[PDB]
């Protein structure tokens, strides 16, 4: 029948005897009141990973059957709270009141059923904005060594969803829980938290609640693009849910495979990552693009978890630390990152100065890749060296402060249309701070122009303003 | 029946066989009391922790003193609970054993003494606090580029031989006089030649008073070893919670815990992971680390370090330690070579506190200009290595010129090297310091010999340095 | 004048003569360190497939 | 209480029976050599086995001897060479002591030790110079093939003379004609008269080879004990790391780092941590041990070498390079530190002999920086003149042991810089003439060293100066 | 697909192209079955029936005497290095190979083939 006795319950797992109707995925609950994941139905006894705090269970205690499956709560009442992947309040503020659940684990949207993806999601940040496009329903990678700024570029991310609606979420997979808090403090600082969901597992959380919380994470994000708006899903790493699985595996006594990952990662992922879409005006012109980040050691590539995801998503930023240590920020390098959806994602008045721009930099990486150590060049090669170290000192931000759509395309055309000749590689960070100023000062029909029609200006009326400001600006 | 019987040993690992109903849970201890009954035997007083449960009433356990002498058969007693450690206000000065009793030779403790279990679940996310702010500790590299947080974990990675216990008795010497609470020092992976010296270092300055102190050696089984950690964890635990102080709680090498867990994991009988590490790594070094946390009816300020097992970083028990650290110290055998002391990384030292709002925009300015400076020093060594110095111009030159007069300028005097060498030490200011390093990138001084910068204190010391070599 | 331009020839001549000489040298030193490190890496993946082998 | 082997498994075996049997517990089987029992699994036990173990077949006959690991300390095995079982190998006869001591033992607590107090004399310049020694330090020699490594320790173990200065030589996993050479180096110098020497050679099995460095200090520990001083020296120890990557895996161990189980760092902990310095509530012994590491290319970045350098109280490398350059021997100043200076050291040696090993760390990598650029002259004129002459004054030849007084002489003139002015090969002929003129012209400072221990009144030890002016040479 | 071209070419008896989007993902398919079968790895990590598996798939595109079935196929190259298994398996069956580099698709000339490194019989 369906109660089951138990007969190991080391390390976070069990082993249990009985259990005839059981099923894959199952939810069981212990005699203790913590319930756990069924996952391996071997020949004679019945796998049971664990949820909860597992040191109060013994061996010959009874496990009933729930007859349940995996379920999460979703409604909107979630929004603007902090809540674990098993659906409970962690923050204060009492209950939510989450009108239905939907299951963890479901199938996605066909192929038929999606379109194609041609509005943006703007970050404000220049670098990605212009050189590495995205647009709502693509799946990007974010990977970098640590300390290099995977956070960072999320929470820019999130802030910036002010002014355009978005439903956004994120996820936290087994951070300090003190940075967790330092991150919710933040959001709510920037004033930012009130449209958004954070799921939180912590470090100290037992090994399924890692493994299961991007899973519950998207569960809450669909909900809300099956409404019809749009919806972004963060993961802040997924390396450690994958460790999270290699450790529950390898206790189950399944055949491992390269490093010791089993050999279900690629799947297990797969299942994670192809639920984002953009489904069709038939189905309500949604929308759920995603941004998870994996963690390279040492600048490592071509291992197992990294060429894994780098083939699932539609495209990589690849972040370097001796960029960042050198003073570009974010450090983004435009070289190994790629968008297959770029060009389309992009506004019109963007994509004619982005486009171009990639050409520029694409040209002096290269050149400046083995002719800098050499003291003197050819002139025209003096000129490129010139244009590519302004385009870098151009492209590099401040902390937090997210720049509008409306006045990086103002200054990548006034990058690339050449009207910085003049001004000296250390100044240009103040002659960006001076000018947007100015751009607020005069100049607000360019802009509006540029908000509704996504088009560019008139060119007469575009010099002649950046013409003004550079009357106005004084160089040191 | 609640006594049982040992039916397999396999070195630190025991397997005792309870009989039916009567199965500790995990993390439970046991005691072994058996008389010395005929001519070939030996006595021994030994405990051990239950660690799985196997089916068929067996349960492997952990002893905590070494297995010579066990006989299959021999009797083992339950005490019910975890490893009960006596905590309150007569811990401070005394020295304990991994079990809670007493070795300082003073005397023992009272028996009416509370008694507290080792393990315990973490503080919750409602529970934490993050006003964060310097703790301001004189070490000039650590006061510049990876400023230390009053109420977070720090960090020490280094390898054998770097200079990690040397920077510890610095810290204690310039914090644990002023700090005003409760310390808790616990030895893990100690050598007791330190330990040794370090309880002479505490009487005589008379800082023992206050202080309690928690003791494993290297030449403990694993056991032990592991189980050091928690044992001094759950005395400063104490005193944060019910007497409010801040506490400042030191572990000498945490690396030795996640070892032994190695060591004994594989005798337990779970299969290898990416460099024979036992499969659960993250979980329960994450679930040790996630307890040593500043609630808001407290503070602790943690200073840990970390031997990395080789001078690779990208190892298993390094890398998931990287993300638990507010502020880490990065030390580097090649720097130390040179002679540099502490021999600090500066370009990857990270800590949380480097933030315009927490330091001020002086001295963030100044953290990152250092930075940008070293890392362009490193790209030229190799380009001079190939063409010459005579080849390099301009931004190039004045690079390598300040590189190594910065790379110098880092090392100081610690007032604990006295014993190593003859010189005496210094205590620098924040604002010493970063008018110091503004003066070197300005480059004012840039006259004076690179011989000069080495192991001092401020700007002024180098100018009389200077002068003495004929400048 | 001509002496002088002739002689910078020679001069830069055996000075991109002998930085290619110490280029050389070098790329030498860090091949047998890549090679080292590789198949370091290889031998500890296999011990890993050995240990995984007997263990299961 | 009787048992039979059940597997000969290449030095393992395996035995049915014993059900009495302890962990560590000896068993000596109906051929005669012994077999030391480690795990009791639920219906065998496992018996290393110690000793020619061809003789062994299935279904041979285990009895008890019913003691743990004893190994035999007395009086009566001074001077003698045996084998780790405490055996005679050297023929000259039995020998007659009467207790046995364990081989595992409880390493002194916290409470029990002491700092440091008193040096060990090595009578090598830039041992005592630059890494001094002290009684209970454990150090580290460490380095590759044919690099001088006995060469410092029988130079040590001759230097300890008008002392009760105990003292042991333990060969691992080594070549009969080189023990059976230096066992008559020793004998020819006389030096073997009070030292102990324990053989295991490379054609006996690995349990004979991982055991031998226990047996030492198990010798040791008599000693210490009753109260004498003791030396240890282990000929190799990753040679015994070799045995047990052998022997573990003869086991069904899972390997690790490099095949080495995590067990390494245990097992030379076990081994290093009796070294001791015991206070007076003891009876004040000492135990001081210097073990040998042998690199394989200079890789001190490896396993076992890091393993090891955690466990000890310093390190001394030893370089190649230097020593086949001529510099017979070398020591690289910028590896080589010892954690227990100053306290150790003589007070005049502390007044000259303390910043010296920083100024050479400082000399190599401005050497380096001098490849590649033009230099400064203060810098140039400092610190390369005083690091090339610092070299050429701690340079040393084949068994010529120094007192510490000529040693502190010329320390002095050093880093005070009084023979600054006399270059390369006239330093050395330079300090040569100087210890041969002093010999008989310095009695009073040479006693005021020996009684006093502090360096002598400055007057008189420049008239040590004036006067070799007038006797050195020229050149 | 292979089965579906094989009827055109064997019934209608005319030249039936067969096109494969990427084949490294196939390869990296069999990889992670054979480790659920639970064999064991080798060299990368790759299953050890990796020239058989593929020579099975690769040797029925051919011209029997009905007709043909050209295929063009596409690899996906991990790292710039070729010597991984999956393409080095490959080359041997191919029979003219043109190599397409990420330099001139950023230059903005297109279709992205390098003129030197491209090769046919
Ligand atoms: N645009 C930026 N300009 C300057 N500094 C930045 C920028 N973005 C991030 N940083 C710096 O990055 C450091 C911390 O990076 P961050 O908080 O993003 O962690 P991370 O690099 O994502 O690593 P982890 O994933 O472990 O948090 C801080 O010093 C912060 O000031
Ligand atoms: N600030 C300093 N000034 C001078 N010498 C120093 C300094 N810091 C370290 N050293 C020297 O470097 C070594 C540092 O010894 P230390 O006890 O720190 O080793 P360790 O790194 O702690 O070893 P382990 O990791 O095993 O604990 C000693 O030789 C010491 O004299
Ligand atoms: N200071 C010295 N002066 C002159 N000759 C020396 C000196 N040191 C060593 N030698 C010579 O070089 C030989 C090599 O050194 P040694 O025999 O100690 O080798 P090793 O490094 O100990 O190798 P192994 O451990 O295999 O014996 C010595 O036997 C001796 O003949
Ligand atoms: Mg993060
Ligand atoms: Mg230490
Ligand atoms: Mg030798």
């Known amino acids: 029948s369906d109660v089951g006795t138990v007969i190991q319950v080391g390390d976070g797992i069990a082993r249990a005897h009985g259990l005839d109707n059981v099923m894959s995925g199952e939810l069981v609950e212990f005699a203790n009141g913590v319930m756990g994941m069924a996952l391996n139905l071997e020949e004679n006894n019945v796998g049971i990973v664990i949820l909860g705090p597992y040191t109060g269970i013994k061996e010959g205690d009874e496990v009933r059957r729930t007859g349940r499956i995996m379920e999460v709560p979703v409604g909107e009442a979630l929004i603007g709270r902090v809540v674990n992947p098993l659906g409970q309040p962690v923050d204060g503020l009492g209950p939510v009141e989450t009108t239905e659940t939907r299951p963890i684990e479901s199938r996605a949207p066909g192929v038929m059923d999606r379109r194609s993806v041609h509005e943006p999601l703007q970050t404000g940040i220049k670098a990605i904005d212009a050189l590495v496009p995205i647009g709502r329903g693509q799946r990007e990678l974010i990977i970098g060594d640590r300390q290099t700024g995977k956070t960072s570029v999320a929470i820019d991310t999130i802030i910036n969803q002010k002014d355009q609606n978005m439903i956004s979420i994120y996820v936290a997979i087994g951070q300090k829980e003190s940075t967790v808090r330092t991150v919710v403090e933040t959001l709510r600082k920037h004033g930012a938290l009130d449209y958004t969901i954070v799921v939180t597992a912590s470090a100290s959380q037992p090994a399924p609640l890692l493994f299961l919380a991007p899973y519950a994470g998207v569960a809450m994000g669909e909900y809300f693009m099956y409404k019809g708006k749009h919806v972004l899903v963060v993961y802040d790493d997924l390396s450690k849910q994958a460790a999270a699985y290699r450790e529950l595996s390898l206790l189950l006594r399944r055949p491992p495979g390269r490093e010791a990952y089993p050999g279900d990662i690629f799947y297990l992922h797969s299942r994670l990552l192809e639920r984002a879409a953009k489904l069709s005006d038939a ?3 949604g929308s759920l693009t995603a941004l998870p980040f994996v963690e390279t050691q040492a600048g490592d590539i071509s291992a197992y978890i990294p060429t894994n995801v780098i083939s699932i998503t539609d495209g990589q930023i690849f972040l370097q630390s001796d960029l960042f240590f050198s003073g570009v920020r974010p450090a983004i390098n435009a070289g ?18 982005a486009g171009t721009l990639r050409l520029d930099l694409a040209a002096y990486r290269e050149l400046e890749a083995f002719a800098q150590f050499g003291s003197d060049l050819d002139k025209a090669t003096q000129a490129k060296l010139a244009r590519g170290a302004r385009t870098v000192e151009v492209l590099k931000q401040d902390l937090h402060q997210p720049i509008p759509v409306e006045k990086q395309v103002l200054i990548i055309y006034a990058l690339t249309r050449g009207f910085l000749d003049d001004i000296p590689v250390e100044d240009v960070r103040r002659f960006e701070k001076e000018f947007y100023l100015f751009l607020d000062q005069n100049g607000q029909h360019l802009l509006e122009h540029i908000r509704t029609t996504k088009d560019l200006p008139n060119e007469d009326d575009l010099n002649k303003a950046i013409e003004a400001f550079k009357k106005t600006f004084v160089v040191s | 029946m609640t006594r049982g019987r040992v039916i397999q040993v396999m070195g630190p690992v025991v397997d005792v066989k309870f009989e039916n109903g009567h199965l500790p849970a995990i993390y439970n201890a046991l005691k072994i009391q058996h008389k010395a009954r005929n001519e070939n035997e030996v006595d021994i007083d030994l405990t051990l922790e239950v660690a799985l449960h196997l089916g068929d009433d067996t349960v492997r356990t952990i002893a905590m003193a070494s297995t010579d ?74 006061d510049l580029l990876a400023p230390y947080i009053k109420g977070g974990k720090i960090g020490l990675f280094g390898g054998a031989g770097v200079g990690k216990t040397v920077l510890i008795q610095e810290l204690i010497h310039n914090i644990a006089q002023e700090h005003g609470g409760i310390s808790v020092f616990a030895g893990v992976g100690d050598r007791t030649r330190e330990g040794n010296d370090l309880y002479h270092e505490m009487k005589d300055s008379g800082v023992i008073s206050k202080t309690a102190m928690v003791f494993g050696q290297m030449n403990e089984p694993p056991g032990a070893r592991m189980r050091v950690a928690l044992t001094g964890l759950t005395m400063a635990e104490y005193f944060r919670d019910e007497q409010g102080q801040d506490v400042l709680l030191f572990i000498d090498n945490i690396f030795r815990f996640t070892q032994a867990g190695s060591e004994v994991s594989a005798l337990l009988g779970r299969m290898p992971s990416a460099v024979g590490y036992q499969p659960t790594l993250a979980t329960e070094m994450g679930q040790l680390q996630e307890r040593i946390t500043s609630t808001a009816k407290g503070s602790i300020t943690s200073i840990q370090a970390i031997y990395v097992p080789a001078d690779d970083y990208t190892d298993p028990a390094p890398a998931t330690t990287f993300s638990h650290l507010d502020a880490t110290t990065n030390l580097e055998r090649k720097l130390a070579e040179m002679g540099i002391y502490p021999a600090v990384d500066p ?66 005097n610690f007032h604990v090297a006295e014993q190593f060498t ?4 210094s205590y620098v200011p924040v604002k010493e310091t970063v008018r110091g390093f503004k003066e070197i990138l300005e480059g004012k001084y840039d006259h004076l010999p690179e011989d000069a910068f080495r192991l001092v204190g401020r700007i002024e010391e180098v100018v009389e340095k200077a002068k003495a070599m004929g400048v | 004048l001509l002496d002088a331009k002739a002689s910078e020839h020679a001069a830069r001549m055996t000075a991109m003569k002998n930085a290619t000489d110490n280029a050389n040298e070098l790329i030498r030193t860090l091949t047998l360190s890549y090679n080292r490190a590789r198949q370091a890496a290889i031998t500890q993946e296999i011990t890993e497939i050995v240990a995984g082998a007997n263990a299961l």
């Open chain 2, 347 to 412: 370009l990857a030292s990270t800590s949380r506190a480097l933030a315009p709002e927490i330091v001020g925009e002086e001295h963030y300015q100044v953290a990152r200009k250092v930075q940008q400076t070293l890392q362009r020093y490193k790209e030229l060594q190799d380009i001079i290595a190939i063409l010459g110095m005579d080849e390099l111009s301009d931004e190039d030159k004045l690079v390598v010129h300040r590189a190594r007069r910065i790379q110098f300028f880092l090392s100081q």
């Open chain 1, 336 to 353: 190994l990152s790629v968008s297959r959806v770029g060009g389309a994602a992009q506004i019109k008045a963007m994509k004619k100065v």
């Open chain 2, 422 to 425: 003859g010189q005496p030490g």
């Open chain 1, 283 to 285: 189905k309500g012109g």
């Open chain 2, 69 to 142: 002498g066990l006989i299959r058969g021999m009797e083992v007693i339950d005490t019910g609970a975890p490893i009960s450690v006596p905590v309150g206000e007569v811990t401070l000065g005394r020295v304990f054993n991994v079990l809670g009793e007493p070795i300082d030779l003073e005397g023992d403790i009272p028996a009416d003494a509370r008694r507290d279990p080792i393990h315990r679940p973490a503080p919750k996310f409602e529970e934490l606090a993050t006003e964060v702010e310097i703790l301001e500790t004189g070490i000039k590299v650590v």
